[PDB]
Design a protein around this ligand. Structure first.
Ligand SMILES: NC(=O)c1cc([N+](=O)[O-])c(N2CCOCC2)cc1NCc1cnc(N)nc1
Length: 294
């Protein structure tokens, strides 16, 4: 804009370009997101504005919402790195378990907070989990999906990833629950441990079938109501469930136990963020600092 000197393009967001910028008047450095098209839904602005009050140490702070000139800009707290990039950079040796645990623990605290205020993310992924040199990790873009919806392609035509999508969404459920975020976080947890995406689908059916091939094709015993879902087909192949010891080796039993609860098929059975914070996996949790080269 005019009150902000663009320092650099941080990246291409799912809704528009994102710039690192300096507030010319207060000198603060922030992240500036330009969102998408003929006027901007007034319903969206009321909803987004509401998010300015959703403040927590593990949630990227929304500093301002600007509509003027009939364009939509969101100003956010700035963090130097995202988890996707950090994982790529840690691929050779992997992120130390104490750091994975600390990150998961903080992420769950952030989810527990938003969920307690009835705000869902809906599109969690490594790219929107931001980290700093102090060992903190924060969730970015909470609540935006509800306001703008999640597109197939971003403004740049890039394909939005389906890797972290909960199965109830893939099966066509119209109503999402907080459980969809726990699923996504479980997939990210598995990816930090193994250094390979858990379910890297490249289409909705491929994503769904990758889940089925690992966790078993769901049925009425494990997921009451599943055969009645909108996109469920009796013709889906029936795959047997695999053992977790084979899915996220060499994670220990506390870790495997927690992950299994975060990946339950039935959204109602899936562990809540609050209950996950009490899981024995976090008994020895600590707050290490990452080796961050900026
Ligand atoms: N709020 C923020 O500070 C922030 C926002 C977004 N965003 O609004 O999307 C973002 N993206 C994540 C990857 O997709 C591109 C944009 C990254 C951010 N920060 C970490 C970071 C800073 N610089 C560089 N080069 N890479 C990462």
């Amino acid at each position: 804009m005019e009150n902000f000197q663009k320092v650099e393009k941080i990246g291409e967001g799912t809704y528009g370009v994102v710039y690192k910028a300096r507030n010319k008047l207060t000198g603060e450095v922030v992240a500036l997101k330009k969102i998408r098209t003929e006027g901007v839904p007034s319903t969206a602005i009321r909803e987004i504005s509401l998010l300015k009050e959703l403040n927590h140490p593990n949630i990227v702070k929304l500093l301002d919402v600007i509509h003027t000139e009939n364009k939509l800009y969101l100003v956010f707290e700035f963090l130097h790195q995202d988890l996707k990039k950090f994982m790529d950079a840690s691929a050779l040796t992997g992120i130390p378990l104490p750091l994975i645990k600390s990150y998961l623990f903080q992420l769950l605290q952030g989810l527990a907070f938003c969920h307690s205020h009835r705000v869902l993310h809906r599109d969690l992924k490594p790219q929107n989990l931001l980290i700093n040199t102090e060992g903190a990790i924060k969730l970015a873009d909470f609540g935006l999906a509800r306001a703008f919806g999640v597109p197939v392609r971003t403004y740049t035509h890039e394909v939005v990833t389906l890797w972290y999508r909960a199965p109830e969404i893939l099966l066509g459920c119209k109503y999402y629950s907080t459980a969809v975020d726990i699923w996504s976080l479980g997939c990210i947890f598995a990816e930090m441990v193994t250094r390979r995406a858990l379910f890297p689908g490249d289409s909705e059916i491929d994503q769904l079938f990758r889940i089925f091939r690992t966790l078993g094709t769901p049925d009425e015993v494990v997921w009451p109501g599943v055969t009645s879902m909108p996109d469920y087909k009796p013709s889906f192949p029936k795959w047997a469930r695999q053992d977790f010891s084979k899915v996220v080796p060499p994670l220990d039993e506390d870790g495997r136990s927690l992950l299994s609860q975060m990946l339950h098929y039935d959204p109602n059975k899936r562990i809540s963020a609050k209950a996950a914070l009490a899981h024995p996996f976090f008994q020895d949790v600590t707050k290490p600092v990452p080796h961050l080269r900026l």
